[PDB]
Structures are given as structure tokens and as C-alpha cells.
């Protein structure tokens, strides 16, 4: 139930959905900066499973899950 295994599940689900992780990494960085992500329907649905308030409220860079996801995307892209 920890943030790290949850972030890993996000990455897993993004790959399943056909996402380009390099692109998601860039998008997500910008999202944390306050810029909407341009996602496929499938990619949006993954994000909504884990960041339910994202559309009206954005994503908080200080949240444990956002931190874990940024870490996971960086490691996967490296
Ligand atoms: Cl940058
Ligand atoms: Cl749908
Ligand atoms: Cl949320
Ligand atoms: Cl938190």
C-alpha cells in the first residue's frame, strides 16, 4: 500500500497502455509545475486511477505518490 509499489503499478499500467515513458516523464514534470498533461484516453485513465483529483486540482509535487512516481519514471527512463 506504500507509495513506491503504487508508483511502480502506475508505471506498469502506463506501459500496458502503450505509453512512451520518456514522454510521460517530461509531461509529469510539467504537470508538477502546473501545466496540464496531453494524454491519450488510456494514459489519462491510468492517471485518474491514482490521482483522482488531477483534472480540477492538479497534482501536488510534495505528495508521497507524486515523489515516488517522479523517482520511478526517472529510473525507468535512465
Ligand atoms: Cl526540463
Ligand atoms: Cl474511458
Ligand atoms: Cl489526486
Ligand atoms: Cl502525501
UniProtKB/Swiss-Prot annotation:
Domain of life from the UniProt record: Bacteria
Parts forming coiled coils: none
Localisation per UniProt entry: Secreted
Function as written in the Swiss-Prot or TrEMBL entry: Effector protein involved in gene-for-gene resistance in tomato plants. It is recognized by the host Pto resistance protein and elicits Pto and Prf-dependent hypersensitive response (HR) and programmed cell death (PCD), resulting in host immunity. In susceptible plants, promotes virulence, in part, by enhancing the development of disease symptoms and bacterial growth.
Additional information: Unlike other effector proteins from the HopAB family, lacks the anti-PCD region and cannot inhibit cell death triggered by AvrPto/Pto.
Subunit-level organization: Interacts physically with plant cell Pto.
Family: Belongs to the HopAB family.
Name of this chain's protein: Effector protein hopAB3
Amino acid at each position: 500500500t506504500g507509495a513506491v509499489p503504487r508508483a511502480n503499478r502506475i508505471v506498469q499500467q502506463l506501459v500496458e497502455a502503450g505509453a512512451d515513458l520518456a514522454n510521460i516523464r517530461t509531461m509529469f514534470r510539467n504537470m508538477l509545475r502546473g501545466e496540464e498533461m496531453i494524454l491519450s484516453r488510456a494514459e489519462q485513465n491510468v492517471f485518474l486511477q491514482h490521482f483522482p483529483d488531477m483534472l480540477p486540482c492538479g497534482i501536488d509535487r510534495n505528495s508521497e505518490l507524486a515523489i515516488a512516481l517522479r523517482e520511478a519514471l526517472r529510473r525507468a527512463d535512465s
